[PDB]
UniProtKB/Swiss-Prot annotation:
Stretches assigned to the UBA domain: 9-58
Domain of life, source organism: Eukaryota
Record organism: Homo sapiens (Human)
Cell location: Cytoplasm; Nucleus
Function statement: Interferes with CBL-mediated down-regulation and degradation of receptor-type tyrosine kinases. Promotes accumulation of activated target receptors, such as T-cell receptors and EGFR, on the cell surface. Exhibits tyrosine phosphatase activity toward several substrates including EGFR, FAK, SYK, and ZAP70. Down-regulates proteins that are dually modified by both protein tyrosine phosphorylation and ubiquitination.
Protein name: Ubiquitin-associated and SH3 domain-containing protein B
Subunit structure comment from the entry: Homodimer. Interacts with JAK2 (in vitro). Interacts with CBL. Part of a complex containing CBL and activated EGFR. Interacts with ubiquitin and with mono-ubiquitinated proteins. Interacts with ZAP70 (ubiquitinated form).
């Protein structure tokens, strides 16, 4: 016996001391706040996964 393992489950963030952000996350991935911003904004800012899809996905008004 002895010892255990409480708290900290899975852990999904660049540290526990400071909380992350859907944006800060993208920043960690290597994306510019802008990119994440534009995306976030577009997709409001709920999930970072959705934004990504948007990011990659060509966004713009079909010109011609």
């Amino acid at each position: 016996g002895s010892s255990g393992s409480s708290g900290r489950n899975r852990q999904q963030r660049p540290g526990t001391i400071k909380h992350g952000s859907a944006l800060d996350v993208l920043l960690s991935m290597g994306f510019p706040r802008a990119r994440a911003q534009k995306a976030l904004a577009s997709t409001g800012g709920r999930s970072v996964q959705t934004a990504c899809d948007w990011l990659f996905s060509h966004s713009g008004p079909s010109s011609g």
